[PDB]
Amino acid sequence: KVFGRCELAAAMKRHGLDNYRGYSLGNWVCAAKFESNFNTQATNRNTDGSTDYGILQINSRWWCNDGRTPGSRNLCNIPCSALLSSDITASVNCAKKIVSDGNGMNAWVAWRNRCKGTDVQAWIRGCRL
Ligand SMILES: [Cl-]
Ligand SMILES: [Cl-]
Ligand SMILES: [Cl-]
Ligand SMILES: [Cl-]
Ligand SMILES: [Cl-]
Ligand SMILES: [Cl-]
Ligand SMILES: [Cl-]
Ligand SMILES: [Cl-]
Ligand SMILES: [Cl-]
Ligand SMILES: [Cl-]
Ligand code: NA
Ligand code: NA
Secondary structure, three states: OEOOHHHHHHHHHHOOOOOEOOEOHHHHHHHHHHHHOOEOOOEEEOOOOOEEEOOOOEEOOOOOEOOOOOOOOOOOOOEHHHHHOOOOHHHHHHHHHHHOOOOHHHHOHHHHHHOOOOOHHHHHOOOOO
16 A cells, blocks of 8 residues: 555554654654655565565564575564555554664664654644644
């Protein structure tokens, strides 16, 4: 599914991401925009052989099992394919564990490179929240 911007912000807010570990909702929408373009079915290969899955591009090295990523872990205890659902629940829940892992949203390189230090409130401008 390709989410609308405000649709996704509403769903993320409903799932408790606004100010989760101190990250305002626009940070999460910004990350989603540059990871997936709001598309739940997005998959992209990493240089290390792992793959990133779903609206927040969660990686198979640490977080989900895709059956093809050597010496990897599955800390969210989920098949990576379940991150591509039109229901963002599994993505959101797994992201809550990643952001709690110590480096905050720096775990998402695209957040660090494209959202951090910018006016992320812009991503929820106009949304009825
Ligand atoms: Cl929308
Ligand atoms: Cl947009
Ligand atoms: Cl929702
Ligand atoms: Cl915000
Ligand atoms: Cl498997
Ligand atoms: Cl393959
Ligand atoms: Cl694997
Ligand atoms: Cl594991
Ligand atoms: Cl949803
Ligand atoms: Cl932090
Ligand atoms: Na990416
Ligand atoms: Na894995």
